[PDB]
Amino acid sequence: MEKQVIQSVGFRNIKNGNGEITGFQFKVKLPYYRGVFLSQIRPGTLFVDGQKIEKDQITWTINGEEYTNQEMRGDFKTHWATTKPAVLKVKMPGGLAQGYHDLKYGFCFTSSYMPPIIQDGLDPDKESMVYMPEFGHHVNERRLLIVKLAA
Amino acid sequence: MEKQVIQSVGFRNIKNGNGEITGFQFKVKLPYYRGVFLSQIRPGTLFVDGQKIEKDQITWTINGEEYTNQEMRGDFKTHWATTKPAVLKVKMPGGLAQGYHDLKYGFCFTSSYMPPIIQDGLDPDKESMVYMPEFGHHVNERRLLIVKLAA
Amino acid sequence: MYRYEKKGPKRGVALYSYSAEFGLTKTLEDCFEDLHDMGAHGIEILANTHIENYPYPTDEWVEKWWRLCDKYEIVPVEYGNWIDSHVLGDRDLTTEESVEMLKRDIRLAHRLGFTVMRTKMPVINDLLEPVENWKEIIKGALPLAEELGIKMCPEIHTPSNLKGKLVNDFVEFIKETGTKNFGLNIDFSVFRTSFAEGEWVDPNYTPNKPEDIIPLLPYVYCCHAKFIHMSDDFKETTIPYEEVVKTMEDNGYEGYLLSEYEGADKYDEGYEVGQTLRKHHILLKNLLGD
Amino acid sequence: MYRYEKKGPKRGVALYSYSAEFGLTKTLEDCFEDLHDMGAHGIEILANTHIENYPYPTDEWVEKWWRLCDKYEIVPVEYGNWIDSHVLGDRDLTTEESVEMLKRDIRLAHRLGFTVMRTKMPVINDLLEPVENWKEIIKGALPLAEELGIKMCPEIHTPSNLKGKLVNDFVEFIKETGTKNFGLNIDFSVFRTSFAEGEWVDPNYTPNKPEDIIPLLPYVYCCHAKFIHMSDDFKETTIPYEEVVKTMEDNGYEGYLLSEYEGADKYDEGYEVGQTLRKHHILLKNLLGD
Ligand SMILES: [Mn+2]
Ligand SMILES: [Mn+2]
C-alpha cells in the first residue's frame, strides 16, 4: 500500500442499483505498529473541500463486512490488520464532481497500555501533545481525483 | 523490495561447510519494466571499496538455481522476473570485514526491439548516452554494513 | 464473466503506465482497483511482467486472475508479447523456435481472455522494420490465432509515419494473405504536434493528421492512447485528442483506446501516476460518453 | 527445526524495530533474511502484527512460518501479546474473558514455537501498574502456560526503576505462587545514562546501575536490548552496554537480548533501520562472541 493514511486506490463515487450516486468511498490504512479490534476504533470527522461530514454518515468495511460506528463500538473480537486498509463509505447524495477534491479525515484508536495522561484526552479530530510516529497522526489529508462526466 | 537496484537484504559473507569464508553475496533487482531470459543478461564489473572484481568471479542465482555467466549466455528459456531479485555470489576468500562497504556494480540486458543505434554499444559498465529510466542505470551503488567479529 | 457492451470506441489502461510502481507499491490487484476507480474496463498487460511464474502460471493463479477480472469489471483486451529471435547473443532463433514461442504466448493470452496481442519483434534498421523472416513467423502462428480468435498487431509509433514503409509492409501482408487475425496497433504519438522549446525531435518524424488513420481503420484492432501532458482542465496539450477520437468514432472503430504514459517522471520520488491517469480518463470519458 | 545452542546470553531482533517498513517495503520473509544477514537467531513478533489472519491463522500459514524459521535459522523466542481488558469503551472485560483471550494467545505462541510472552496489560496509574485483577488473570492462565512451557513476562522500562514498586509487585507474586512460568522482561532503557542537551527526562526516572539487575536475574526470561544511538565505531553512546552484558554473562543469564529500536527517525523518508540494527549487532556480536 501507500505510506500516507488516506490511500489513492479505492477513492470513487458509489452507485445505487437504480443508477443513482448515493455517496463515495475512500480507504484508510491503520497507521499503527499493530492491529486493533473494532471496539478500539474512534472515528472522527470528514471534510471534503471544506464541507463537514459527521461520523454518523460514514460506515467502515473491514474484512469484507460493513460496520456502523455503534456495531464497531461493541465488537472486540473482529481484528483490523495493519496491512488491510478499511473502506470508509460516506453517505452523500450525488457524490463528488469530476476533478480534484481535498480530503481531511480524523480517527484514532485506544491504547490502554499507555500512561493515563496520554490516554485521557484522546480525540479523533485533534493531535496528541507529543507526536509519536508509531501511532500516526489522528488527522490526515490527501488531494485526489474523481473521474466523472462534466457537471 | 527496495527502490534501489542493490538490495540491502541479502548482503552477507558466505561460509564453507568447513567454516571458512569463501566470498560474499548481495542481491540485485532487475530495474526493467519486464522480465528477461537469462541469455539477455550482460553481467559487468564489481567494485568493493575500490577493489575490482571481474564477472568471472560472480555467479547468478535465479529461481533458486545458480548459473555461471556461460550457462546464462546459452539459456533463453529460464525467465528472470522483475519481482525476484537475483543473488550474486562473489568469490573472495576471507570475505568482507566488519563494518561499512561501498559497492558499485554494473550489468545490463539486451532489448532487441529498440533502435539499432541504441542497441549497438551497450556496455554493462557504462551508461547509455540518453537515460531512459524504465531501463534503469547499468551501474548502481550502495553503502552497506557487514556484521562480523573485529579483525 | 464481466462484458463491456458499449458501442464504438472504449477506454482502458495499459499497465505499463504503472511500471515504476508495479511490484513496489502496487500489486496486480491495486492496478485492477485503480482502473476500477476510473470506471475503465479495458486492460493491457505485459506477458513478461504481470503473469506470476511466467511462462507457466498455475491453475490457481489463472483462477485468481479471472476472479480479479470479474471483481473489478476488467475486460482483458491486449496482451503484450515479444517474439525475441535475438534472445541469444550467439545466433538468431530459427523460424520454428520463434513460432513455438509465439504460439505459447497465443495460448496463454487466450487462456487469460485476451483478444489482441501487441507483438514486438527485434528490429533490423533505423526504420524499425522487423526481422526479415517475420512473415514466415507470423504465417506459422496465424492458424492457431484464427482458431483461438486472437489478433496479432505490431505497434506503429513515432517516428514511423502512417504513410511510411513500415505500415505499408504490414498492410500489404494483410492484403496478400487475406488474414483477419493480423492487424495494427496505432500509438497516438503519431499525431503529436506540440513539443517543448529545445526538445529534440527526430527529423524523420512528421505529425500525421487524424484523418490519416481513416484508410487503416479496417486493420486497427487496438490503440495506445499515448499522452504527454494533462492540464488541470483535463485537456491533453500535445495531441489533437478531440479530433482523433471523433475521427475514430465517425469511421466505425469498435476497439479500445488504452492509456499509455511513459514520461520519465514516472520514476521521480513522489510522482503519482494514478492521478495522471485519472486526468487522462476524465478527458476520455468526456470525449466518449462512458 | 533449527536450534541455537550457544551457552550464555544470545542476541536477536524484535520485529517492532521494522514497524515503519513491515507491510510496506519489508515482508515477513524480508525481516527473517535481514536477521539472517546479521547472524541473529532470536526473534520477537507482535501477535497483532506478524500473524496473517490473526487471531486464527491457517495450517498453511503456520507451515510457511515454520519453513521460514528453518530456512533462515530463526528461533522463535518472544511473542508479544496484549491482554486488553479495556478493549471495550463501555466496560472492562471480566476476569474470565481476559483469561480466555490470554489462553488463546498462549496456544498460538506455543504453536509457533515461542517460549516467552511479552504480555502487556492496561495500566491504571502513573506508576504504570496493571489492572487490579491482574493476579487473577495470570493465575487463570498459569496452568496452561506451565503445561506448554511458556513464560509470561511483563516488561520493565523507563521510568520504572528496578527497585521500585512495580518490579517488587511482580517479584512478590512470583515468590508467593512459586511459579516458574511468570517472570520479567527488562528493557535496557532502565540503564540509560546519557541524554541530549535540552531533552526532557521524567523526574521520576533514575538510571539503574548494571549490578541492579543481579538479584532479579532468576526471574528475567528475556530482555529488550533497547538502544538509542550507534556510533560509527559501533558503540552504543547512551547505555553502558559492555557492563550490562558482562554483568549478565557473569551471573548466569541464558536468555536472549533482542534489539529494539524505537527512534522517531524510523518514520523519516530514507531511513534504513536495517543498517541501524546491523550497527547494533556488530556491537552485540563483539560483546557476546557469537
Ligand atoms: Mn505505445
Ligand atoms: Mn521495550
Numbering used by the authors:
A (entry chain B), B (entry chain B): 1 to 151
C (entry chain A), D (entry chain A): 1 to 290
What does the paper say about this structure?
Here, we present the identification and structural basis for the activation of xenobiotic C-glycosides by heterocomplex C-deglycosylation enzymes from intestinal and soil bacteria. They are found to be metal-dependent enzymes exhibiting broad substrate specificity toward C-glycosides. DgpA catalyzes the oxidation of the glucoside moiety of puerarin to generate 3”-oxo-puerarin, in which the 3”-oxo-sugar moiety is cleaved by an unusual C-deglycosylation enzyme complex, which is an α4β4 heterooctamer of DgpB-C, to produce daidzein. For clarity, the DgpB-C and DfgA-B complexes are referred to as PuCGD and EuCGD, respectively.
To elucidate the molecular basis of the enzymatic C-C bond cleavage reaction in the activation/inactivation of xenobiotic compounds by CGDs, we solved the apo structures of PuCGD, EuCGD, and AgCGD2, and the co-substrate structure of AgCGD2 with homoorientin, at 2.50, 2.40, 2.30 and 2.25 Å resolution, respectively. The heterodimer structures of EuCGD and AgCGD2 were similar to that of PuCGD, with RMSD values of 2.2 and 3.5 Å, respectively. The major structural differences among these enzymes lay on the interface between the α- and β-subunits; the α-subunits of PuCGD and AgCGD2 (represented as PuCGDα and AgCGD2α, respectively) were composed of a TIM barrel domain and an additional domain with four α-helices (lid domain), which was not observed in EuCGDα. Instead, the loop between M121-N133 of EuCGDα, forming the active site cavity, was six residues longer than those of PuCGDα and AgCGD2α. On the other hand, 11 residues were inserted in the loop between β7 and β8 of EuCGDβ (T110-V139), as compared to those of PuCGDβ and AgCGD2β, and the loop was involved in the formation of the active site cavity. The difference anomalous Fourier maps of AgCGD2, PuCGD, and EuCGD suggested that these enzymes contain Mn2+ as a metal ion in the active site. In contrast, EuCGD acted on C6-glycosylated compounds 3-5, but not on C8-glycosylated compounds 1 and 2. In the model of EuCGD with orientin, furthermore, the B-ring of orientin also clashed with active site residues including Leu128α and Pro115β.
